[PDB]
Structures are given as structure tokens and as C-alpha cells.
Amino acid sequence: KALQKELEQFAKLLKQKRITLGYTQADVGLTLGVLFGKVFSQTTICRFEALQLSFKNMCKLRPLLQKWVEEADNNENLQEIRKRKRTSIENRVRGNLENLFLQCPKPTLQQISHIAQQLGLEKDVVRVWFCNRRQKGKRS
DNA sequence: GTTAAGTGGTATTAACATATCCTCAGTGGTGA
DNA sequence: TCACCACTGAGGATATGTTAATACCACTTAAC
């Protein structure tokens, strides 16, 4: 209910403290990583300050930012002194994988290993990309 | 026979590439 | 021979589109 407006007020004050403290959003992610271990990317901080993330995510990142703003005010010099690695797919690999579809929608792990070795991609990367391919094709 | 773990299936989540934009530095047309 | 504001480009820093990656849940399967 009013949690929406309370989050919004917190986010506006958070923007004000970030601008006052002279920290970039990438620097905010770096500080969160070096003070908690869960380093976040600057896109998440952007979507936070603009209030773009979902409600559950909104509540999930509320406490970390609360702690950072309540702690970093003491000393900055010592603080100044674990990403969800997300490998990209280049266009020719994308085209080759699309070619691998339209014939066998759900390949076996035996074929998955061959596909991974053929295009030089990690097995887990190819497996998750295959799952998301199925997912977006089943959307429609 | 019951209960905990593995397997998928689908919803959320969060980072990448590139698209915009802020701000500051470098050059100069015009004026004095 | 001086000012300077206008004018614009560069790099860093934000907003987007988009999709790897994880995470939550129903179903089956293995252990005592």
C-alpha cells in the first residue's frame, strides 16, 4: 500500500545523498560489493533511482542501500582504498543456433555438448540460452 | 509407505551493448 | 592587441532494449 510512497521518498532521498557524496552509480555498486559481497551493476541502481525495478526487487534492495547510506557517512578514504557473469552471444553464433533450431526444438545433452564444443561456448551458457530460447518461443 | 532430493517448467531479475545526455575543455567571430 | 560568449566535441556518466541467469513451483523418484 503506502510502501510504494515510502519507497519513493526513500529513493528521492537516496538520489540526494548519492549526488551530495560524489559517488557514481558504478561506484555505488562497487561500494555495495566491497561492503556486502553482492556487487550490483549500475543499471540496477539506475532503475532503482528511477523506480523501474519490480516491487519485490524494490523491497529486496531497500535494506542494502539503507545500510550503505547509514554507514558510509563516517569515513570514505579507507573504503575507497561477485557479478552474475552474463556472457554475450555474437551475431554469427546467434544465427548458427537459430539454424540449429527449426529442426530439433529440444536437443539432448549429447547433442548439447557437441554444439558447445562447435561454437566455443560454455556448456552451462548454452544450456541456459537453449532454455530461454524455448521460453521466448513458447511465449507466443 | 512416507519424505527428501532431482528434474523439468515458467516467472522474476539483473547485467550487457548501445543509445542519450551533462558538463567541461578548446577554438574563434565579433566587438572593444 | 584583449574578452567572451557562442559553439561544439569528448569522455564520463546516466537511461534504454534486450536478453543470460537465477529463482520459485509441480511432478516424479530414491532411501529406511
For chain A, what is the HEC assignment?
CCHHHHHHHHHHHHHHHHHHHCCCHHHHHHHHHHHHCCCCCHHHHHHHHCCCCCHHHHHHHHHHHHHHHHHCCCCCHHHHCCCCCCCCCCHHHHHHHHHHCCCCCCCCHHHHHHHHHHHCCCHHHHHHHHHHHHHHHHHC
Strand B nucleotides within 7 Å of a protein CB: 9-17
Among A73, A98, A116, where does a domain finish?
A73
* Rounded-to-10 torsion of CA A104, A105, A111, A114: 100
Q: Please check whether strand B approaches the CB of A41 to within 7 Å.
A: yes
Q: Are residues A53 and A106 in the same domain?
A: no
Count CA atoms closer than 13 A to A40's CA, side-chain side: 20
Same domain, A62 and A119: no
Question: Is position A112 within any domain?
Answer: yes
Q: Which of A63, A9, A6 is nearest to A36 (CA)?
A: A63
Asked if the structure places residue A108 within a domain, the reply is yes
Q: What cell numbers appear for A92 in the block?
A: 554469427
Please give the single-letter amino acid code of residue A71: E
The length of chain A in residues reads 140
Q: Are residues A90 and A131 in the same domain?
A: yes
What kind and span of H or E run contains A11? helix A3-21
A45's CB contacts (< 8 A; 6+ apart) are A25, A28, A29
Question: What single-letter amino acid sits at A70?
Answer: E
Count CB neighbours of A117 within 10 A. 11
CA–CA distance, A128 with A85 (Å, rounded to integer):
13
Q: Binding site for DNA, residues of A?
A: 18, 25
Q: Domain for residue A78, yes or no? A: no
Residue A130 corresponds to which amino acid?
Answer: F
Q: Is residue A128 part of a domain?
A: yes
- Cβ of A46 less than 7 A from strand C: yes
Q: Are residues A15 and A63 in the same domain?
A: yes
Residue that has been written with the C-alpha cell 557524496 in this structure: A21
Query: Which are the contacts of A23, defined by CB distance < 8 A and separation ≥ 6?
Result: A31
Question: Are the C-beta atoms of residues A61 and A53 closer than 8 Å to each other?
Answer: yes
Max alpha carbon distance in chain A (Å)? 61
Query: Do A23 and A44 fall into the same domain?
Result: yes
And the C-alpha cell for A65?
Answer: 542501500
- Tell me, yes or no, whether A51 and A16 share the same domain: yes
The experimental resolution of this structure, in angstroms, equals 3.9
The experimental method is: cryo-EM
Q: Which of A73, A98, A120 is the last residue of a domain?
A: A73
Could you give the number of structural domains in chain A? 2
Please, are residues A26 and A44 in contact by the beta-carbon 8 Å criterion?
A: no
One domain for residues A29 and A53: yes
Looking at the domain assignment, is residue A32 inside a domain?
yes
In contact, A41 and A83? CB cutoff 8 Å? yes
Domain range for residue A130? 83-138
Q: CA A59 → C1' B7, Å?
A: 31
Angle at A62 between CA A43 and CA A7, to 5 degrees: 95
Q: Which residue has the cell 500500500?
A: A1
Residues A94 and A48 in one domain: no
Establish if A2 belongs to a structural domain. no
Reported for A15-24, long-range contacts at CB under 8 A and 24+ positions apart, including other chains, are A15/A49, A17/A69, A18/A49, A21/A72, A21/A76
Which residues 88-127 of A interface with strand B at a CB distance below 7 A? 88, 106
